[PDB]
Amino acid sequence: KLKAPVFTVRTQGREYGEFVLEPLERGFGVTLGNPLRRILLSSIPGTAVTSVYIEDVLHEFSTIPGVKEDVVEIILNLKELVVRFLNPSLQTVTLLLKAEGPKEVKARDFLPVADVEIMNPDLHIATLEEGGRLNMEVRVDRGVGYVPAEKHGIKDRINAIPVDAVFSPVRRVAFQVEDTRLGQRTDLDKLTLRIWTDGSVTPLEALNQAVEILREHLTYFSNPQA
Amino acid sequence: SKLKAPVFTVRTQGREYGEFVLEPLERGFGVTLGNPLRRILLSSIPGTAVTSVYIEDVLHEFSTIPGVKEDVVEIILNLKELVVRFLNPSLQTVTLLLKAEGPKEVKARDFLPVADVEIMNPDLHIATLEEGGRLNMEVRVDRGVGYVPAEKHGIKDRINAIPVDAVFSPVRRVAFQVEDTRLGQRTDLDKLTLRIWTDGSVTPLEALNQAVEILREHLTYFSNPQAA
Amino acid sequence: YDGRTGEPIEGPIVVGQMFIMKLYHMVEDKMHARSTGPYSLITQQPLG
Amino acid sequence: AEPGIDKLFGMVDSKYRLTVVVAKRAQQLLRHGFKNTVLEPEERPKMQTLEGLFDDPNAVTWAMKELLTGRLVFGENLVPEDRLQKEMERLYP
Amino acid sequence: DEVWDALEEVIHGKVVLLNRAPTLHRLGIQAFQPVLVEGQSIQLHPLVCEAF
Amino acid sequence: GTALDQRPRVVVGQRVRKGDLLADGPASENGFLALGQNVLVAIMPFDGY
Amino acid sequence: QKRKLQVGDKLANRHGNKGVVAKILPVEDMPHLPDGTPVDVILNPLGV
Amino acid sequence: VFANPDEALLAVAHGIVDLQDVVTVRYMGKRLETSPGRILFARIVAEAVEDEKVAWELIQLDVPQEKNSLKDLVYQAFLRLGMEKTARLLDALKYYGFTFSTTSG
Ligand SMILES: Nc1nc2c(ncn2[C@@H]2O[C@H](COP(=O)(O)OP(=O)(O)OP(=O)(O)OP(=O)(O)OC[C@H]3O[C@@H](n4cnc5c(N)ncnc54)[C@H](O)[C@@H]3O)[C@@H](O)[C@H]2O)c(=O)[nH]1
Ligand SMILES: Nc1ccn([C@@H]2O[C@H](COP(=O)(O)CP(=O)(O)OP(=O)(O)O)[C@@H](O)[C@H]2O)c(=O)n1
């Protein structure tokens, strides 16, 4: 046989991670990389902005006097808002934003709420000049994966605009399998996994969650109910 | 929004065919479970194969035996199709003895009985002998994994033994099907069906269990971070 | 279907039986290397 | 490509001059057993084997890296060859 | 076994010249770092085939 | 350098008519020219190999 | 000698398509039909 | 309408859109009506040359990439960056071209 492999970690901040597993038996590199990639892109729980309410706008293709950006731009900026829930009981959260005067509206202008943490207060939301106003109501849920706005279409109020829900805290995953040798054997595998997240969960935590999900699903082949 | 444990259903045909159904699954998980299991089943399931052959008054594989229609190369090709089941997990190697005299149709059933060893295809044709032909064979069968060519292991018991390429995998074919299913309000859910054809030495359920164990052991490896 | 991932190839693929032969040009008979060896009589150059 | 090949090509007026300088520096390194190098131990070119990290045995790599460091002087009629050789022996036995 | 490791030590950093006849231009000979492989066939990069 | 052998294609007691095949020659399958193998092929690019 | 197919050997069909074997893949990596049957040879369409 | 290339490629990974479908993506502070495939090609070049502004300058986004455009890209990358980065970009292009030709069908 062959000895147990070595697992190596290289983390950049809490936003980038590289993971190296070597050596592996022939063909196991893709066998491990592909399901992990699918789970990472599909099944890691997270939070996302789901709905938005702005007054005096009837649809997403309108505009607000007093703000340089259109509705689409502020919605797109809201798509990158990262929110972390600290207690497991919290499910949905409503955030209110009040803005007046010539100012640079970021995330920290959101009013504080218990057991909700904003991870990017420096994210740019809007620009107001003199005499401009912005009152915003954003509904944030928790889910998994990517759900388009038309699929859920949940709008708290009659004027609320559904938003594409980027639930996945993982932004990107790539992986590469490279040939490696050990002693006389020369057909072994080395697996490299690169993960970019949004910061709510570190890449190592996301990888651990994906591995745990795969292990739980493998447990399912045990009891032949029928 | 956590999903309930899916139902696992088993259908079996003999010791050679198995269908294993898992339903319902989250969208996209059918491939995520089926493909690695298919790769492991086709790659890493241990089995048994003929690894060495010794024939009387035969010095090498490129010869003929008087009274025998087939030359040694064709006889070894026939012997590579022999399916041998080891009843004892601790057993590693066995040597089957065959002695025959013409005229007859020497099949796999003519091998002398051995304890804790079964021949799963006794009807497999081995040779044709005419009047005056004699066949004396010692066939060494081993446990192993994967495909090992004769030039690699080079196993010889006696001086005149002929090493034989060993294809240890007992699994013949693997397929899996992902079908549409749903559960109440959830839609676009997956139903996974694994179809396994083996040669009878290992049942499809046993191979599936070993594949699950291999995948779990390999998933275990992600638990010891090291700094670079 | 792709054996590495299990996902299908994005388009249908032409598949069928073909008759293929092995040619006598084999790499076993052609691979050759030399560090030093015999030399020619007159020119004292390596043989061919 | 070789690391910093553009820098080396820009450090000389003719690419063949760069080749000549690299070859001569490599010969100097080989003659003295790498004792005349201008590299400090942390910049030394390393090679990975089963036993462990060792020094890179290829002298052309050493000479190229040294040329990247910029501590080497090259030109026409800098020092008479005999005096250079004698001093090289005296400093490095 | 150790002689193969010695061989890996020998060729470290060195290059070899690959040539395909007919050598119509100068790019019919090119220098490459050798990676030791099993088998009896030379492995060539896809992007140099047009030059060769 | 190729090996040419003839392999019997009949059994003892078999009835043979005139011109009936008795033994296959090299590169022959039951009296048909057999220069290669029938394989399942897919026409597609594959990873640059 | 009993020679098996290896990398570098030349194969051809009857219509003038020739090529050397450049890669031998394991069975689990080859493209397969929905019933689980893998293909034996992959030919590049760019030669047609 | 996608806020960044990562979102568009995530939507591609979920089967929402194809690589050849024309959508709206926000890239480099601008709103481009393009396809996820062309955004992916731009990202490939940018990561190969380790320079986003120069890579954006080099590529022609609004055309399918064919022999002439790729050759012009290689020449311009040579001129702007040097042999080392040009070779790195060449290797990246070879890898991704092979990968996408395999699964294209
Ligand atoms: N510079 C160069 N490159 C060539 C040439 N011709 C082919 N290539 C390359 O080789 C690849 C495969 O070409 P092929 O698919 O044609 O295969 P082959 O190896 O040439 O073999 P044959 O089909 O000719 O078989 P044979 O039994 O007739 O060989 C025995 C008879 O052939 C002739 N012959 C055999 N070998 C050679 C050789 N080395 N040089 C010249 N004549 C040769 C000769 O007259 C001999 O007396 C092509 O793509 C090209 O890269 C050539 O003239 N010059
Ligand atoms: N006497 C020779 C014959 C061949 N050659 C070399 O072999 C190559 C292919 O010729 P070839 O005839 O084998 C094929 P090609 O023209 O590339 O194929 P296609 O149009 O059917 O696709 C030529 O381009 C020359 O470099 C040579 O140097 N001297």
Side-chain angles (χ1 to χ4, degrees):
Chain A
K1 298 179 183 184
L2 91 170
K3 294 179 179 179
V6 173
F7 183 45
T8 279
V9 181
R10 290 193 296 274
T11 59
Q12 173 182 359
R14 76 187 285 85
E15 302 279 10
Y16 183 44
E18 312 198 6
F19 315 88
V20 170
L21 196 57
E22 60 170 69
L24 294 158
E25 199 46 83
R26 184 190 67 182
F28 266 94
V30 290
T31 308
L32 289 180
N34 276 293
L36 284 177
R37 181 179 180 274
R38 295 172 67 88
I39 294 167
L40 281 164
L41 290 177
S42 84
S43 312
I44 309 305
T47 52
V49 157
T50 290
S51 180
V52 85
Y53 176 77
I54 319 278
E55 307 86 295
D56 288 345
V57 278
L58 280 312
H59 31 61
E60 63 185 342
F61 315 102
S62 64
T63 191
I64 289 92
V67 315
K68 93 160 55 193
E69 296 109 345
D70 46 324
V71 155
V72 201
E73 205 75 351
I74 49 98
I75 289 198
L76 287 195
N77 286 319
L78 279 158
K79 281 174 145 43
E80 337 174 323
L81 182 57
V82 178
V83 174
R84 200 209 268 124
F85 290 175
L86 311 107
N87 62 346
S89 45
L90 244 194
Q91 186 173 355
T92 179
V93 159
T94 296
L95 299 313
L96 275 297
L97 186 142
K98 303 293 183 179
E100 300 283 0
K103 79 174 317 278
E104 265 327 292
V105 181
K106 315 334 163 93
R108 71 171 65 199
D109 292 38
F110 275 120
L111 62 80
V113 171
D115 270 23
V116 167
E117 177 193 334
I118 291 277
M119 320 270 321
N120 52 49
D122 311 338
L123 158 82
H124 185 193
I125 298 281
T127 59
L128 285 290
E129 294 85 357
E130 280 85 346
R133 71 171 64 199
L134 195 61
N135 172 10
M136 189 159 55
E137 183 280 335
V138 302
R139 172 186 178 179
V140 173
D141 306 356
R142 58 159 88 236
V144 293
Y146 185 89
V147 185
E150 295 85 357
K151 297 293 180 65
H152 58 90
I154 57 195
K155 33 175 176 295
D156 284 1
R157 207 136 37 172
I158 217 170
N159 285 322
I161 280 301
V163 177
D164 300 297
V166 194
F167 287 124
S168 177
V170 165
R171 297 291 189 62
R172 179 188 167 183
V173 47
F175 84 95
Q176 279 261 51
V177 182
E178 335 191 13
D179 289 345
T180 200
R181 34 162 304 180
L182 157 80
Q184 209 51 78
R185 303 185 65 170
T186 45
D187 37 44
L188 307 180
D189 280 13
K190 143 171 137 63
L191 158 69
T192 310
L193 248 176
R194 295 147 74 210
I195 306 174
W196 299 257
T197 68
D198 62 3
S200 51
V201 299
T202 65
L204 188 53
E205 293 177 350
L207 178 60
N208 281 330
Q209 278 181 69
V211 168
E212 195 54 348
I213 283 162
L214 194 39
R215 183 206 56 63
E216 181 137 25
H217 264 82
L218 283 176
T219 284
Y220 286 1
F221 279 109
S222 64
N223 211 262
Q225 186 173 355
Chain B
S1 183
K2 189 74 189 308
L3 207 35
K4 288 311 226 303
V7 186
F8 177 48
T9 309
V10 171
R11 303 181 287 255
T12 44
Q13 272 106 314
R15 293 181 48 88
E16 317 240 2
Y17 182 58
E19 292 187 2
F20 314 91
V21 181
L22 209 62
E23 77 167 354
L25 293 170
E26 280 302 320
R27 137 82 176 267
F29 263 89
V31 164
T32 303
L33 295 174
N35 195 63
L37 287 181
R38 167 167 197 277
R39 293 177 58 79
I40 290 163
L41 280 160
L42 285 172
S43 179
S44 322
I45 302 301
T48 53
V50 163
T51 63
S52 178
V53 167
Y54 167 87
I55 313 181
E56 183 178 2
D57 289 345
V58 159
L59 303 166
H60 45 82
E61 164 182 49
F62 312 96
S63 42
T64 57
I65 305 156
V68 181
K69 169 170 168 175
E70 295 94 352
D71 72 282
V72 179
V73 162
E74 172 71 38
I75 288 175
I76 288 179
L77 280 187
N78 290 339
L79 275 168
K80 272 165 55 142
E81 291 306 290
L82 181 74
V83 187
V84 177
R85 176 196 185 186
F86 287 0
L87 280 312
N88 179 7
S90 64
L91 190 62
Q92 279 332 85
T93 189
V94 69
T95 293
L96 305 147
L97 292 212
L98 200 143
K99 281 158 262 73
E101 286 215 356
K104 75 174 310 168
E105 311 271 303
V106 182
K107 321 250 158 211
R109 68 171 71 277
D110 299 343
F111 274 116
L112 294 206
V114 177
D116 317 308
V117 171
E118 189 190 344
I119 306 287
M120 288 292 330
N121 48 349
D123 261 335
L124 164 88
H125 172 85
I126 302 274
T128 295
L129 275 66
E130 64 162 4
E131 179 95 281
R134 71 171 65 199
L135 194 50
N136 186 340
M137 287 213 309
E138 300 172 359
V139 184
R140 172 177 175 178
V141 172
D142 281 25
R143 278 191 195 273
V145 281
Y147 165 57
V148 185
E151 323 79 47
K152 240 198 76 168
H153 60 80
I155 291 163
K156 303 203 212 233
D157 300 325
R158 307 166 72 114
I159 270 71
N160 289 355
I162 303 164
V164 181
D165 300 319
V167 186
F168 288 110
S169 177
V171 166
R172 294 183 182 277
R173 188 153 59 116
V174 176
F176 72 92
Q177 171 112 345
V178 186
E179 318 203 57
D180 181 65
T181 196
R182 58 176 182 183
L183 166 85
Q185 294 299 297
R186 300 283 298 300
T187 206
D188 272 286
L189 297 177
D190 288 21
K191 154 194 214 217
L192 172 63
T193 311
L194 273 145
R195 319 217 274 145
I196 304 175
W197 296 262
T198 67
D199 63 356
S201 39
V202 185
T203 74
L205 196 38
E206 288 173 23
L208 176 59
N209 292 345
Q210 301 188 60
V212 167
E213 177 58 10
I214 286 154
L215 196 46
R216 211 207 27 81
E217 169 128 31
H218 267 84
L219 283 182
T220 281
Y221 298 155
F222 283 95
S223 294
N224 267 332
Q226 315 243 66
Chain C
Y1 297 146
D2 186 18
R4 285 90 57 85
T5 65
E7 311 161 40
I9 312 299
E10 292 170 14
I13 295 295
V14 170
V15 164
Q17 268 182 315
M18 218 192 259
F19 185 70
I20 300 180
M21 326 165 291
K22 208 224 283 198
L23 294 203
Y24 51 32
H25 302 275
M26 294 181 254
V27 65
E28 237 188 300
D29 302 300
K30 294 152 171 54
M31 187 218 92
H32 171 50
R34 145 181 185 144
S35 37
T36 49
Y39 297 98
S40 152
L41 259 183
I42 298 177
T43 63
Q44 280 296 323
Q45 284 169 10
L47 287 186
Chain D
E2 303 303 355
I5 187 65
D6 295 280
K7 251 185 107 184
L8 296 173
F9 274 151
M11 290 175 24
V12 289
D13 51 17
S14 179
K15 54 175 303 179
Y16 312 114
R17 173 163 277 125
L18 165 76
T19 309
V20 166
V21 167
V22 166
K24 273 168 180 174
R25 185 56 195 179
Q27 259 155 46
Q28 291 177 327
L29 288 170
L30 281 185
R31 165 168 344 112
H32 294 310
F34 295 118
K35 295 190 271 263
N36 54 296
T37 174
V38 301
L39 296 166
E40 230 74 77
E42 55 298 19
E43 322 146 305
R44 285 180 152 232
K46 299 296 183 181
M47 186 209 41
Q48 185 92 270
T49 82
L50 295 174
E51 297 120 36
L53 290 289
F54 296 94
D55 276 336
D56 208 316
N58 193 282
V60 171
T61 318
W62 279 72
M64 256 155 77
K65 215 182 193 331
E66 276 170 286
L67 254 167
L68 271 306
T69 84
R71 295 159 211 162
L72 291 172
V73 201
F74 58 90
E76 300 284 77
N77 319 133
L78 301 183
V79 161
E81 293 177 350
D82 68 82
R83 310 172 69 125
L84 199 91
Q85 194 78 2
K86 295 167 235 223
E87 179 135 5
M88 288 313 259
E89 289 137 72
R90 181 254 284 180
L91 205 32
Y92 317 99
Chain E
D1 186 348
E2 307 75 40
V3 292
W4 299 117
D5 299 9
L7 186 58
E8 218 70 59
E9 286 231 315
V10 153
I11 65 167
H12 186 256
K14 291 187 122 95
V15 295
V16 298
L17 301 189
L18 294 192
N19 166 232
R20 184 191 167 272
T23 316
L24 297 183
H25 50 210
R26 84 181 180 191
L27 292 171
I29 304 180
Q30 289 188 54
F32 297 91
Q33 287 203 350
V35 183
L36 296 199
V37 302
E38 306 277 338
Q40 321 190 229
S41 286
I42 293 154
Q43 302 184 358
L44 199 76
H45 198 274
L47 290 190
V48 301
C49 292
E50 45 254 68
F52 280 113
Chain F
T2 55
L4 326 164
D5 66 9
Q6 297 179 291
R7 307 185 265 201
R9 294 292 173 239
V10 287
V11 290
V12 165
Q14 187 176 301
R15 298 295 299 278
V16 291
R17 294 183 181 277
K18 204 208 205 71
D20 274 15
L21 181 76
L22 301 181
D24 256 329
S28 186
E29 187 200 40
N30 270 71
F32 292 88
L33 190 62
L35 293 177
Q37 311 272 5
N38 300 298
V39 296
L40 212 58
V41 313
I43 304 182
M44 80 192 267
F46 201 85
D47 279 336
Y49 280 109
Chain G
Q1 340 179 28
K2 211 170 72 168
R3 290 186 194 170
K4 292 220 263 314
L5 202 48
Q6 60 172 341
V7 168
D9 284 343
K10 208 176 158 186
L11 304 170
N13 62 25
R14 292 170 292 169
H15 309 269
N17 202 41
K18 47 181 175 184
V20 296
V21 169
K23 183 73 160 176
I24 305 181
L25 294 172
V27 62
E28 75 260 16
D29 284 336
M30 292 288 281
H32 59 279
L33 300 164
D35 62 62
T37 304
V39 300
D40 305 273
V41 172
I42 312 173
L43 293 187
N44 201 301
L46 286 168
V48 183
Chain H
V1 175
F2 299 105
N4 47 65
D6 266 334
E7 185 188 357
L9 288 176
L10 182 67
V12 167
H14 275 94
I16 309 299
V17 288
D18 278 331
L19 282 185
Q20 289 84 10
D21 291 326
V22 174
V23 301
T24 297
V25 199
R26 170 165 92 197
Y27 196 32
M28 293 264 159
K30 236 175 58 184
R31 221 140 83 241
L32 306 152
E33 288 127 42
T34 172
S35 70
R38 295 176 174 184
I39 284 299
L40 177 52
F41 178 77
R43 174 169 96 186
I44 287 165
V45 180
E47 299 219 325
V49 304
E50 314 250 50
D51 204 324
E52 261 76 3
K53 324 279 218 53
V54 190
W56 187 249
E57 273 199 40
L58 294 169
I59 65 107
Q60 325 169 40
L61 186 69
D62 282 76
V63 280
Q65 295 305 99
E66 42 87 45
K67 194 171 130 291
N68 282 319
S69 82
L70 288 172
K71 185 227 285 156
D72 199 58
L73 165 66
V74 170
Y75 181 67
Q76 289 301 325
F78 190 93
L79 284 191
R80 288 211 50 142
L81 305 166
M83 305 168 3
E84 233 196 328
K85 294 195 162 193
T86 314
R88 261 191 265 130
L89 164 69
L90 280 169
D91 271 348
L93 291 171
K94 167 213 72 183
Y95 171 81
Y96 282 103
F98 281 153
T99 281
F100 292 130
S101 72
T102 302
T103 65
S104 55

